[PDB]
Amino acid sequence: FEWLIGSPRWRESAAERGDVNPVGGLEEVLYELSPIEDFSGSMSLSFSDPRFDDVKAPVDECKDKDMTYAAPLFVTAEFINNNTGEIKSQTVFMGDFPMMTEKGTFIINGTERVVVSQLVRSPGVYFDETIDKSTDKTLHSVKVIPSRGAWLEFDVDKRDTVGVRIDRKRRQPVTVLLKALGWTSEQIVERFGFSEIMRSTLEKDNTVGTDEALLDIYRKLRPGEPPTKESAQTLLENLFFKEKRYDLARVGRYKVNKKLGLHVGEPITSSTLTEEDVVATIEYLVRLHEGQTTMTVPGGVEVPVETDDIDHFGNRRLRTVGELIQNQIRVGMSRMERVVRERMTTQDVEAITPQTLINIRPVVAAIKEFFGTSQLSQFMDQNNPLSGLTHKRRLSALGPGGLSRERAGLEVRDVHPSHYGRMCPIETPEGPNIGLIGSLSVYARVNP
Amino acid sequence: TDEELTARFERDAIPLLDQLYGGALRMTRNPADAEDLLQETMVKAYAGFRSFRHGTNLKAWLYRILTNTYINSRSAEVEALEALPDTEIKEALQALPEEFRMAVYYADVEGFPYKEIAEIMDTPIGTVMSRLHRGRRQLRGLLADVAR
Amino acid sequence: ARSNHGTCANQCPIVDAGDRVEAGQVIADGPCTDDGEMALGKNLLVAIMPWEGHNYEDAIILSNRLVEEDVLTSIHIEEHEIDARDTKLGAEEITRDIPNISDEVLADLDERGIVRIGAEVRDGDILVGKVTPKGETELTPEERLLRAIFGEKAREVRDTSLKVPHGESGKVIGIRVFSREDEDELPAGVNELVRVYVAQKRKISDGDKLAGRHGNKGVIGKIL
Amino acid sequence: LVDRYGEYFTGAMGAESIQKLIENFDIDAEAESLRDVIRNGKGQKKLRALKRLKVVAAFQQSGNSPMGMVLDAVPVIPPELRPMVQLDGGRFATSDLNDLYRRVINRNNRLKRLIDLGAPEIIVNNEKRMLQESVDALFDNGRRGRPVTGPGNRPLKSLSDLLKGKQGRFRQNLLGKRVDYSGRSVIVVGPQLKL
Amino acid sequence: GGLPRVQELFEARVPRGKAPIADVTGRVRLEDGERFYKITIVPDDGGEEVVYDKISKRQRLRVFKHEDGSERVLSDGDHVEVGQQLMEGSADPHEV
Amino acid sequence: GSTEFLPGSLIDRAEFEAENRRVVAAAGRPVLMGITKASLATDSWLSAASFQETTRVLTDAAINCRSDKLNGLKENVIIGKLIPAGTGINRYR
Amino acid sequence: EEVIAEHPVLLNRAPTLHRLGIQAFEPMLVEGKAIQLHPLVCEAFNADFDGDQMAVHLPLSAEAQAEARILMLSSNNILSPASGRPLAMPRLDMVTGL
Amino acid sequence: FGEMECWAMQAYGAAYTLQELLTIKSDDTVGRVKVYEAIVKGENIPEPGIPESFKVLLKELQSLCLNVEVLSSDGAAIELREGEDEDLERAAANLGI
Amino acid sequence: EFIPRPVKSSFREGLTVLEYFINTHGARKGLADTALRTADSGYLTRRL
Amino acid sequence: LDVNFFDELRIGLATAEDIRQWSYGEVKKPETINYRTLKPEKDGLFCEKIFGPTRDWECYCGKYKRVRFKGIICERCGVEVTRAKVRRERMGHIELAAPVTHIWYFKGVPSRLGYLLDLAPKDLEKIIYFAAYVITSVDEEMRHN
DNA sequence: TTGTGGGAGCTGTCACGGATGCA
DNA sequence: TGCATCCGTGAGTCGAGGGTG
RNA sequence: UCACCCUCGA
Ligand SMILES: [Mg+2]
Ligand SMILES: [Zn+2]
């Protein structure tokens, strides 16, 4: 929570960490949202500084009057009109932000509550070996899962092929995507030449070309509407490489740059898919059938080729309370950005202010909906001090963004060897939540 | 040229229904309500399509129409004991003369009009109302419980 | 103070006037703390042997001392809530005036119709008196006799008063009340809202669940 | 085909056309042809004709017209069986049946308004499709396409969901029920007792 | 095995072992082949031959092949009854 | 053959033979079927509808215009009638 | 104490795996708020006293009371209807004593 | 009293207990008050009626365009609801008509 | 599968950290398996 | 009163004649109740005229409140004066501008219509949801002329 | 009834019988 | 027009407490 | 009372 706010306790901590670049969670949502540009590019609106006024009511008064322990949230919204070149700063009230107590809990509508750390798979590429097709033949699959955006999936069939299953759509041959990103047959045949499965898929290819690959990817993405190459290029470039609709996590960029070793020279400047990492993922997928230990991308570095464990605590992270609140705030603020863009047209210029563009109703609704109805916001369990203490340290695998309850198999619940010193193997429910709720270990701490 | 205007409507704004359906679902989070809202916007647009000005970019008019139309939008124990009589109001009524008891019953319990009570009891209006008020008084004197 | 699950959370000072405390020391104990350490139970003298079948199949035999000396006694607070609001027939009223009710049962209620602090409540005792306007559609024929003969005009109501649930009894600790007549935030239509807190001292008893730290559970078969 | 050679046939879309194809349909001719195929033919087509005969012969008994498979009027369950109870703050909590019937009524009234207003056939076809889909959701939701989601994206309990599952009428309310004159409590051992 | 086998039997499903039984009494011809067995039964009456097409070497021959001959593992030329199982495994109850 | 049956359909042995008895005044083969399939194929549409796959059972039972004899135990449980077993048998009742 | 005399009740523990999971008993009034269960009928119910609870149903009609006294009486069902073996035999502590 | 409990009751062959549990204790609207009244006045327990949830099931099937009808022994569909005039006699008598 | 190293310590001597952590695997595996096993048995019993 | 002794229990498809024969009226409005007075809006989903009186022996407009009048219909409000117990057994109906298919018989596998008309469920999907047309009938005599 | 404008989440489930629909 | 593939169904019983829509 | 969800008990 001190990270989410940016409190000076969290400031000092960062210098010690060496992560010299300190950026709070709210500050991060502001930097992602800023600026807000109109379709004409004439006027921009950028949020700069988060600040907190003192708390509205003490904890005891909140619990007595059925209130929410909260503090007012202000931002510095600077608007710029490029046409008249004028600047209008301001201090805008975002909403009454629920605050965490000193005991680590929240007060929502007069009831004390705890936000359980959720167990979710970290972004990146994950390879698995699917035996048990119709025939005793090892088919290897890989999923590229981001922090936000559209998923990517590469599979191999019973018959030897390679295809891209994109957004649950039917699997189109991967050569379609290769030629859609600008590659030509003479160019891709080179890199995958040692793989005959790719050669067989190109021999079984339906069409060979760049613009027609764009248009066919388009018609695959687009039902019931006429195909066009221009909108094909726009949508295909906007879904993955554009930072708006696609969020590759910093954790995700780190995972993919460690797994594929493509860029290890500290290039964290941008978190997005690089055409080289898609080339690396496809080359990794096809070479995993052979399984040679050392693999070198055209730029990669001696990457070991092996399938990934889904339950390993290097590939399974946890979203703490700050990140969950940040992920609801992000959605609320994106809706507010929609409202801002809608206002920017109908309103009379030279009458607008950063106050008239901003509508804080969706953000307040998002926060209220989270703390009221979210599965991860749980009624605090206080029979004795110990019950609350562990409840605040629980790790829950169920919730939005993680696996559902019907997706919980025996293999996710078992004690993993990576749980040693991280999650306690003894403390867990006896009933249907067995293996789904586990207590954090004593000496363990959560990574940034 | 009314039907011709509707024909060029079928030829002009119909390609925009998909784009502005995306626009309506972009505000209404429920796709079914997005369908309903797009249908309402289309009824509004076709009702006043003749009023629409001819222009180079017609669709922005529909965009504003869409945004404006959206912004415009007892146990068995209790049941068994309820059946039993009060056996206090019962007794007090039994003490009343049957002639006055039936009168106060019809005019007070069942709430007939006085003429209709006179019709039921075969007796004229004077007899009915006299029995009515006299039985009222005798019953008032009979019970002082008044729900305690 | 009542906790979320009904367990009482008291706090008691463990220091005296004039003591020199270093930063980080425990000043006062919580509910299950003792001089700063977690104390979730009691140290009992245990004998490991089958005794006349009363401890058969995981049951537990207790010494009656644990009752007389309040060793396993615990305080359980429970909150009751009732609100008077506006109906279609009118507005509800929280009042001591309850029709067809003896003065003896109302004796523990103040002028407001709310129970008085410190009174002992039993199953069915009135915690908050509340009347609700009756539609008269379900009005009794023998009662319409009364309303028509005696000319009852002003008040036609029924008893919606809050009573104590079955099997629950205790001492009223506190009462808080919010009124629309005063400045308080209440949901729409809700005129008055009153909470009565009731605490009970539960001795250890047959059926209660005892367990150690080693996963050895059981109910109390008999307390000799 | 309608601009030229228009008067020579009849053809349409939606459920009206299915009602017509049922109207002009010979259950006896189709049934006799199918059982003739079963008797004479062999192979997978024999199995296909068997599966189709099992439907047609069942429809071939004592009236029981296939017209019942298309509704011109939808029955409404009594309001008690779809109750609506008050909440805190003037809000009201209702069943899902009421919202389903409400969507059906909304789309049907809008279709009437489109018919009277002479709207383009494309818009009227859209409204007819939406009416069909709403009746589908009311009868069995989630059976086709994504289920209709109330606020919170929960699937609305349809008329079929009331029967299905361990919590449906049959399992939950008919094969076993809650009874009067019953209690429960913690059990402790008494060795004192006779068997 | 275990509870899934009980369910497989009560649901009358075609078992996963798929151990075929004999269709008719008579002489047996055991074919040899890498990873695959083939069985050809010649009925003693002289009716049309019956052929069990292929069985993977993962399956193993039934232990009992004794009416007047060997009480050990089924070999070529043994005498087979009507219902004698031909492979070690789980028989199909529909065939039985 | 002569009687009115659908080939490949499963018919109770006693009812098949009895109908057969009426005839001549029919090539059946014993079939092993699972407990689920034997349960859904019962003569009581109410029992089958309460057991499993309620929607399909109700559709097919509406098409065939079936009439439940209210014979089995679970049917009497559903309609609240005294069950046809134990103390509910006409011999003892 | 008078109205209870010779009026049986039904004791049930979920899950009800066999018919012996519901058994009739003659109720004896007992001080406290817990149900006292005979130790020999545990094996039938698979009932222990580590925190288990059971439910009580009161038959009303003469036929229901007769079925409780005759068919479902505790001392009438001593044998497992599955194997015929007898449950309601001394369980573990009792044996140790013997 | 769940499904498996009814399985057990049937395995016992106790029919009247199962009917009483499922009709006059739970769903028989006219049988519940009848039973309470009979025990209060020290009389015998009457004969069970129809579970109301079965009527709810029939209405639910009718709402699914399924024409459900309860047939007599040899007759046609049987009327399943009751007239309102059954309750007036005893009330007018308790008021001393 | 079985782990090639056994737990040489009895619970009277007390297991080491590693032996306890290794035992947890089978313990929770069985605790979870029984939850599905009872459901399978119950469904089969209902069908019967 | 019923002795729960019924020989047989039959079902079958509901003809539109059956559906209208059952109904006591037609709901024309999406409205449920008037939120000011908490009263059923006429011709709504809770309408008292078609479904029944909310309160025992009362019409909507309030001109009839007594057990005296029973089995008659108020002329102003159009509500029969009777027990509210009928509100659980009185069905309404909805007249559809365009016919619809019962999703049980179309999407229920195997498709009952698809076997009835010998059509593929994919083509039936195209038809019922307005993706493609279908020829209902043709005049072969005039066409041949 | 103007000039602007491409959704939120998921899947980390398994086994089995049958109708669908592709090539 | 033979066969793979996709779709629909099913996945224990009975209790307690809380919140929000 | 209606529906969800959550955490528990055998
Ligand atoms: Mg136990
Ligand atoms: Zn009226």
Short mmCIF file of N, CA and C in Angstrom, two decimals, chain A residues 17-92:
data_model
loop_
_atom_site.label_atom_id
_atom_site.label_comp_id
_atom_site.label_asym_id
_atom_site.label_seq_id
_atom_site.Cartn_x
_atom_site.Cartn_y
_atom_site.Cartn_z
N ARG A 17 17.00 0.05 -2.12
CA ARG A 17 16.86 -1.04 -3.08
C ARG A 17 17.76 -0.86 -4.28
N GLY A 18 18.09 0.38 -4.58
CA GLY A 18 18.93 0.66 -5.72
C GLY A 18 18.06 0.92 -6.93
N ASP A 19 16.76 0.71 -6.78
CA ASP A 19 15.87 0.99 -7.89
C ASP A 19 15.76 2.48 -7.70
N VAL A 20 16.73 3.18 -8.24
CA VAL A 20 16.79 4.61 -8.09
C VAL A 20 15.56 5.26 -8.63
N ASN A 21 15.03 4.71 -9.71
CA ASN A 21 13.86 5.32 -10.29
C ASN A 21 12.71 4.96 -9.41
N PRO A 22 12.20 6.02 -8.70
CA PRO A 22 11.09 5.68 -7.84
C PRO A 22 9.87 6.21 -8.51
N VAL A 23 8.85 5.40 -8.58
CA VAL A 23 7.59 5.77 -9.22
C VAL A 23 6.47 5.03 -8.50
N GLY A 24 5.55 5.77 -7.91
CA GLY A 24 4.44 5.16 -7.20
C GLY A 24 3.46 4.49 -8.14
N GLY A 25 2.51 3.78 -7.54
CA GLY A 25 1.49 3.11 -8.33
C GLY A 25 0.53 4.10 -8.98
N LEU A 26 0.01 5.04 -8.18
CA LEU A 26 -0.81 6.11 -8.74
C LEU A 26 -0.01 6.93 -9.74
N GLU A 27 1.24 7.25 -9.41
CA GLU A 27 2.10 7.96 -10.36
C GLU A 27 2.26 7.17 -11.65
N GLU A 28 2.32 5.84 -11.55
CA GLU A 28 2.45 5.00 -12.74
C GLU A 28 1.19 5.06 -13.60
N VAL A 29 0.01 4.97 -12.97
CA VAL A 29 -1.23 5.07 -13.73
C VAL A 29 -1.33 6.44 -14.39
N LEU A 30 -0.85 7.48 -13.70
CA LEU A 30 -0.87 8.82 -14.28
C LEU A 30 0.07 8.93 -15.48
N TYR A 31 1.27 8.36 -15.36
CA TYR A 31 2.22 8.41 -16.48
C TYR A 31 1.73 7.59 -17.66
N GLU A 32 1.02 6.49 -17.40
CA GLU A 32 0.44 5.72 -18.50
C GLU A 32 -0.71 6.48 -19.15
N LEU A 33 -1.50 7.19 -18.34
CA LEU A 33 -2.63 7.94 -18.87
C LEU A 33 -2.21 9.24 -19.54
N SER A 34 -1.12 9.86 -19.07
CA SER A 34 -0.73 11.15 -19.63
C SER A 34 0.13 10.96 -20.87
N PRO A 35 -0.09 11.77 -21.92
CA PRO A 35 -1.18 12.75 -21.96
C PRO A 35 -2.45 12.18 -22.59
N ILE A 36 -3.53 12.95 -22.55
CA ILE A 36 -4.78 12.59 -23.22
C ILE A 36 -4.94 13.52 -24.41
N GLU A 37 -4.72 12.99 -25.61
CA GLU A 37 -4.71 13.79 -26.83
C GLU A 37 -6.03 13.64 -27.56
N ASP A 38 -6.53 14.75 -28.10
CA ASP A 38 -7.71 14.73 -28.93
C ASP A 38 -7.37 14.17 -30.31
N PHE A 39 -8.40 13.73 -31.03
CA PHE A 39 -8.20 13.14 -32.35
C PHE A 39 -7.51 14.11 -33.31
N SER A 40 -7.73 15.41 -33.12
CA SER A 40 -7.08 16.43 -33.93
C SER A 40 -5.66 16.73 -33.47
N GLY A 41 -5.27 16.31 -32.27
CA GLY A 41 -3.97 16.67 -31.74
C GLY A 41 -3.84 18.11 -31.32
N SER A 42 -4.95 18.85 -31.24
CA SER A 42 -4.90 20.27 -30.92
C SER A 42 -4.79 20.52 -29.43
N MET A 43 -5.31 19.61 -28.60
CA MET A 43 -5.41 19.84 -27.17
C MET A 43 -5.05 18.57 -26.42
N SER A 44 -4.23 18.73 -25.38
CA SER A 44 -3.78 17.60 -24.57
C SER A 44 -4.04 17.90 -23.10
N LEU A 45 -4.26 16.83 -22.33
CA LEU A 45 -4.50 16.93 -20.89
C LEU A 45 -3.65 15.89 -20.19
N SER A 46 -2.81 16.32 -19.26
CA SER A 46 -1.85 15.44 -18.61
C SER A 46 -1.97 15.59 -17.09
N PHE A 47 -2.16 14.46 -16.41
CA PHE A 47 -2.15 14.42 -14.95
C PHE A 47 -0.72 14.24 -14.46
N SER A 48 -0.34 14.96 -13.41
CA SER A 48 1.05 14.98 -13.00
C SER A 48 1.29 14.44 -11.60
N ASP A 49 0.63 15.00 -10.58
CA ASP A 49 1.04 14.76 -9.20
C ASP A 49 -0.11 14.22 -8.35
N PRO A 50 0.03 13.05 -7.72
CA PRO A 50 -0.97 12.61 -6.75
C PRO A 50 -0.64 13.11 -5.35
N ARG A 51 -1.67 13.55 -4.64
CA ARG A 51 -1.52 14.08 -3.29
C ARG A 51 -2.73 13.68 -2.45
N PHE A 52 -2.51 13.51 -1.15
CA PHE A 52 -3.54 13.03 -0.24
C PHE A 52 -3.77 14.05 0.86
N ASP A 53 -5.02 14.49 0.99
CA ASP A 53 -5.42 15.26 2.16
C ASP A 53 -5.59 14.31 3.35
N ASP A 54 -5.68 14.89 4.54
CA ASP A 54 -5.77 14.08 5.75
C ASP A 54 -7.06 13.27 5.76
N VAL A 55 -7.07 12.24 6.61
CA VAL A 55 -8.18 11.29 6.63
C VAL A 55 -9.47 11.99 7.07
N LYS A 56 -10.60 11.50 6.56
CA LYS A 56 -11.88 12.15 6.84
C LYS A 56 -12.35 11.86 8.26
N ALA A 57 -12.26 10.61 8.71
CA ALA A 57 -12.73 10.24 10.03
C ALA A 57 -11.83 9.15 10.59
N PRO A 58 -11.65 9.10 11.91
CA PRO A 58 -10.83 8.04 12.51
C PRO A 58 -11.50 6.68 12.39
N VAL A 59 -10.70 5.64 12.66
CA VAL A 59 -11.15 4.26 12.44
C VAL A 59 -12.36 3.94 13.31
N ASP A 60 -12.30 4.32 14.59
CA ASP A 60 -13.41 4.03 15.49
C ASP A 60 -14.69 4.71 15.03
N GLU A 61 -14.59 5.98 14.62
CA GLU A 61 -15.76 6.69 14.13
C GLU A 61 -16.30 6.06 12.85
N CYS A 62 -15.40 5.60 11.97
CA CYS A 62 -15.83 4.92 10.76
C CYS A 62 -16.61 3.66 11.08
N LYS A 63 -16.07 2.82 11.97
CA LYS A 63 -16.75 1.58 12.33
C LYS A 63 -18.06 1.86 13.06
N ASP A 64 -18.15 3.00 13.75
CA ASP A 64 -19.38 3.33 14.45
C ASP A 64 -20.47 3.83 13.51
N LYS A 65 -20.12 4.70 12.57
CA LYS A 65 -21.10 5.36 11.72
C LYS A 65 -21.32 4.66 10.38
N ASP A 66 -20.77 3.45 10.21
CA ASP A 66 -20.91 2.68 8.97
C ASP A 66 -20.34 3.44 7.77
N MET A 67 -19.15 4.00 7.95
CA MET A 67 -18.47 4.78 6.93
C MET A 67 -17.32 3.97 6.33
N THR A 68 -16.54 4.63 5.47
CA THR A 68 -15.35 4.05 4.87
C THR A 68 -14.14 4.90 5.23
N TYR A 69 -13.14 4.27 5.84
CA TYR A 69 -11.90 4.95 6.19
C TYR A 69 -11.19 5.38 4.91
N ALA A 70 -11.19 6.68 4.63
CA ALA A 70 -10.72 7.18 3.35
C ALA A 70 -10.09 8.55 3.51
N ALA A 71 -9.32 8.94 2.49
CA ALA A 71 -8.67 10.24 2.41
C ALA A 71 -8.90 10.85 1.03
N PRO A 72 -9.08 12.16 0.94
CA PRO A 72 -9.28 12.78 -0.38
C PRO A 72 -8.04 12.66 -1.25
N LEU A 73 -8.25 12.45 -2.55
CA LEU A 73 -7.17 12.28 -3.52
C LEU A 73 -7.21 13.43 -4.52
N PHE A 74 -6.10 14.15 -4.63
CA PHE A 74 -5.97 15.27 -5.55
C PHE A 74 -4.92 14.97 -6.60
N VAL A 75 -5.09 15.58 -7.78
CA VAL A 75 -4.11 15.48 -8.86
C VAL A 75 -3.90 16.86 -9.46
N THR A 76 -2.74 17.03 -10.09
CA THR A 76 -2.40 18.27 -10.80
C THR A 76 -2.63 18.02 -12.29
N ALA A 77 -3.78 18.47 -12.79
CA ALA A 77 -4.17 18.24 -14.18
C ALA A 77 -3.82 19.47 -15.00
N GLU A 78 -2.78 19.36 -15.83
CA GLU A 78 -2.33 20.45 -16.68
C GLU A 78 -2.89 20.23 -18.09
N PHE A 79 -3.64 21.21 -18.58
CA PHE A 79 -4.17 21.18 -19.93
C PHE A 79 -3.39 22.14 -20.82
N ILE A 80 -3.19 21.76 -22.07
CA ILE A 80 -2.46 22.56 -23.05
C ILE A 80 -3.25 22.58 -24.35
N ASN A 81 -3.51 23.78 -24.86
CA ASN A 81 -4.12 23.98 -26.17
C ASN A 81 -3.02 24.42 -27.12
N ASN A 82 -2.68 23.54 -28.08
CA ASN A 82 -1.61 23.83 -29.02
C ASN A 82 -2.01 24.90 -30.02
N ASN A 83 -3.29 24.97 -30.39
CA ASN A 83 -3.74 25.96 -31.36
C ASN A 83 -3.53 27.38 -30.83
N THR A 84 -4.09 27.69 -29.67
CA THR A 84 -3.82 28.95 -29.00
C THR A 84 -2.58 28.89 -28.12
N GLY A 85 -1.96 27.72 -27.99
CA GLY A 85 -0.74 27.58 -27.22
C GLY A 85 -0.86 28.00 -25.77
N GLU A 86 -2.02 27.79 -25.16
CA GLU A 86 -2.25 28.23 -23.79
C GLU A 86 -2.17 27.04 -22.84
N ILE A 87 -1.78 27.32 -21.60
CA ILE A 87 -1.62 26.30 -20.57
C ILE A 87 -2.48 26.67 -19.38
N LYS A 88 -3.23 25.70 -18.87
CA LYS A 88 -4.06 25.88 -17.68
C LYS A 88 -3.79 24.72 -16.73
N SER A 89 -3.08 25.00 -15.64
CA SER A 89 -2.89 24.02 -14.58
C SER A 89 -4.07 24.08 -13.61
N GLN A 90 -4.12 23.11 -12.71
CA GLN A 90 -5.21 23.04 -11.74
C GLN A 90 -4.87 21.96 -10.72
N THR A 91 -5.72 21.86 -9.69
CA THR A 91 -5.68 20.78 -8.72
C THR A 91 -7.08 20.17 -8.70
N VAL A 92 -7.20 18.93 -9.18
CA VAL A 92 -8.49 18.29 -9.38
C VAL A 92 -8.68 17.21 -8.32
#
